[PDB]
Amino acid sequence: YIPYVKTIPKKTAIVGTVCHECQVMPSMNDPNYHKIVEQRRNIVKLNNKERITTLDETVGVTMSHTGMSMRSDNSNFLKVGREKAKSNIKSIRMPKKEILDYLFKLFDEYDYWSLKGLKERTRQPEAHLKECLDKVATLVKKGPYAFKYTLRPEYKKL
Amino acid sequence: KDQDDRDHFGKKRLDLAGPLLAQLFKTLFKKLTKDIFRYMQRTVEEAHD
Amino acid sequence: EVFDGNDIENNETKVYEESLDLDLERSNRQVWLVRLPMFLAEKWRDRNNLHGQELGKIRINKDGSKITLLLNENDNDSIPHEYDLELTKKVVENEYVFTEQNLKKYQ
């Protein structure tokens, strides 16, 4: 057999059995009869669909918004470039003697830390950061934790 | 019964300028929508306006 | 409402506080399957109505063979007040009506 079937239980109850099938039809001898006839005729006579709308304005006025137009778009839709370009922050070269201890505590927090995360956390330029990062740590390129700078074994094995 | 006659004009249809332009416009509009989606993907990915 | 299948661990005892077996107690209840016209169904299947008011009455001849529906005067004199119920199948087999409700998930 199969050990799992993944059923979905629910609360169900049988509350009757059908005995007669009935069709409701308006009586032919009813005073209100032949109103349904008109309604049913209208069901087909009436048409839901409409026609296309034609612009009666001047063609030049209608085309003023097309192509190379003087007016500049004011829409804010899909403004990803604006959204991510507005934010921008830079940092100074604080002396190595402080960021070095900061990096040691960060490494103690975690032992395999990426370059983008390092730039974010230390908030330093890559040019200056690389010198100290190479001086203290090394990058594992072939190991399973590839692309992640890690402290050199000389100081890590302590 | 005999095999259906292929020349029976009742089983034939005449496509006027209406249906022809309809299908041509369908194809062209599908291409236009594809281009719109491509532009959306390009702007979202490459970070353009 | 996803749940285990075979449940050989007897988890239903605590997962559900209600019997999971089909309730075969009201099955002995005569039920009529009635097909209505569009105009009548559009006002009898509405969810913003059916508060328990009297929709009309059913008149059946003593000797049978003829059944009629007499609606009340709530139709706004826009549709017939008298209809005929044509029995498309006097004897009907293998047709039942069942409900569906959720189960308590706690205890």
State residue C53 phi and psi, 5-degree precision.
-75, 160
> 3-class SS at C97?
strand
d(CA A103, CA A92): 16
A neighbours by CB contacts (3+ pairs under 8 Å): B, C
Chain A, chain C: beta-carbon pairs less than 8 Å apart:
156
Query: Which residues of chain A are within 8 Å of residue B44 when distances are taken between CB atoms?
Result: 78, 80
Query: Which residues of chain A are within 8 Å of residue C34 when distances are taken between CB atoms?
Result: 21-24
Answer yes or no: do A32 and C80 touch at CB < 8 A. yes
Nearest to A82 among B40, B44, B49 (CB): B49
Closest alpha carbon to A139 in A126, A152, A154, A124: A152
Nearest to C69 among A8, A24, A35 (CB): A24
Contacts 24+ apart (CB under 8 A), C72-80: C77/A32, C78/A32, C78/A35, C79/A26, C79/A32, C79/A35, C79/A36, C79/C39, C79/C40, C80/A26, C80/A27, C80/A30, C80/A31, C80/A32, C80/A33, C80/A35, C80/A36
Instruction: Determine the distance from the C-alpha atom of residue A71 to the mean position of all C-alpha atoms in its chain, rounded to a whole number.
Output: 31
Chain A residues 51-110 with CB within 8 Å of chain B: 78-82, 84-85
Q: What number of other Cβ atoms are within 10 A of residue A113's Cβ?
A: 20
Who's near C94: CB < 8 A, 6+ residues apart?
none
State residue A17 phi and psi, 5-degree precision.
-125, 130
How many Cα neighbours within 13 Å face the side chain of B40? 8
Instruction: Give the relative orientation of helices A126-136 and A96-109 as an angle to the nearest 10 degrees.
Output: 70
Answer yes or no: do B48 and A80 touch at CB < 8 A. yes
Experimental approach was cryo-EM
d(CA A124, CA A119): 6
Residue with tokens 């026609």: A51
Q: Do chains C and B touch (3 or more CB pairs under 8 A)?
A: no
Who's near C44: CB < 8 A, 6+ residues apart?
C36, C50, C55
Interface of B with A (CB under 8 A): 40, 43-44, 47-49
d(CA A151, CA A139): 8
Who's near C69: CB < 8 A, 6+ residues apart?
A24, C56, C57, C58, C59, C82, C83, C84, C85
d(CA B49, CA B40): 10
CA distances from C77 to A36, A51, C81 (A): 12, 35, 8
| Single-letter code of the amino acid located at A112 | Y
Answer yes or no: do A81 and B44 touch at CB < 8 A. no
Report the residue of chain A nearest B41, measured CA to CA: A78
DSSP state of A73: P
Q: Which strand ranges, in their side-by-side order, compose the sheet holding A113-114?
A: A113-114, A148-151, A137-140
Q: What is the largest CA-CA distance in chain C?
A: 63
